[PDB]
Each structure stands twice: as C-alpha cells, then as structure tokens.
C-alpha cells in the first residue's frame, strides 16, 4: 500500500528500508511531448499524403 519506502526479504529475514528518489519529472514531460509530436506527425500525414 506504499506506507513507507522499503522492500522485504523472507530469506535472511530482512527489511531493506530506504528513500526512493523522486520520480524524474523531465522524462514525464518528455513522454507527453513525444505523444504530442506523434499526433502532430499524424496531422502532417493527413495534410501531405492527401494533398500530394
């Protein structure tokens, strides 16, 4: 349920707790921009392949 940043290990019987680095927002914004450019390329198809 993500109450604290840790992963168990039922072997040696350990609870490796730590701090998870924050999700890099740059890759996020890059991914949505990639999606936007993909749909822009779709628009460019609709223009060119139909007018030429």
């Amino acid at each position: 349920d993500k109450k604290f940043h840790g992963i168990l290990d039922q072997g040696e019987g350990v609870l490796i707790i730590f701090d998870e680095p924050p999700v890099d927002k740059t890759y996020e914004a890059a991914l949505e921009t990639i999606q936007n450019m993909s749909k822009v390329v779709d628009s460019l198809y609709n223009k060119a392949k139909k007018l030429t």
């Binding site: 350990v14 730590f18 701090d19």
Partner: protein, 146 residues
C-alpha cells in the same frame, strides 16, 4: 573538565571517572554518588555519551557497532538503544545496518550533490592556481630584477 567538554575529541567515560571523580570528595551538584534527586551522575554519563556520538558522527562514515560500544563504554544493545533514541529525537543522523552492525553517518548522496561538490573542488582549484600564478609572477618579477 570544561576544556575537555569544549574540545573536539572523544573522552572515554572510564578515564574521565578515573580522573575527575574528586567532585564530592568541593562543589554542590553532579555528586559522585548521593541522595537520589542529586545523583545526576547518570545525566553526566549521558552527556559524555552524547558528546562522543557527536564527535563520531562528525569524524566517521562507517563505525561498526562493536567498536562503537567498546568506545562509548556501553553494551552493544545499550548503545543501540541510545543511538535509536537520538535518531528519533532527530538530534543525530545515523542509519544502522543491524544485519552486520554497520552504523553509517553518510547521508544519502544525491548525484546532484556529488557533482556539485566536484564542481566546487574544480572552482576552488582554478581560483587557487590563478592566485598562485599572480603571486609567483610578482615573486619572480621582483627577485629576477636582482
């Protein structure tokens, strides 16, 4: 006593008690041993322990629990409890690997912070070499005149 508690070095409680126990053997408090409300001796022991913790956190990165206990003059478990209490109080930062007893004071190292430290080292190096070249220019540019 005040010199030791203001200097930045670990003082073993055993040695301090075999040195300055004269108190109440003189003054009016911190009795070596007396009535319960004025046997603060334990509080002084805790103060010595806390000072040692501060010094170690300042001048270590990875101190094994065995060594920490035998240096602090407390059992391994007693030292663990004291360090845990300090960590909870937020007075000290120390992450304890109890699997191997690898108490570590190294705060997590952000790549941003690591490269910033490297860049700061580079900047200091460049400034130092620039100042040195100025000073050495003056040095040679005076003496070679002779």
């Amino acid at each position: 006593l005040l010199k030791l508690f203001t200097t930045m070095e670990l003082m073993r409680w055993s040695t301090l008690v075999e040195d300055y126990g004269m108190e109440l053997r003189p003054a009016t408090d911190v009795f070596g041993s007396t009535e319960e409300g004025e046997k603060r001796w334990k509080d002084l022991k805790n103060r010595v322990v806390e000072h040692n913790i501060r010094i170690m956190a300042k001048y270590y990165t990875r101190i094994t629990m065995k060594r920490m206990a035998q240096l602090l003059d407390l059992s391994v478990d007693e030292s663990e409890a004291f360090l845990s209490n300090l960590v909870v109080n937020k007075t000290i930062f120390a992450k304890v690997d109890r699997l191997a007893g690898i108490i570590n004071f190294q705060r997590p190292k952000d790549p941003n912070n690591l490269l910033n430290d490297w860049s700061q080292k580079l900047n200091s190096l460049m400034s130092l070499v620039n100042k040195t070249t100025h000073l050495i220019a003056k040095e040679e540019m005076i003496h070679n005149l002779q």
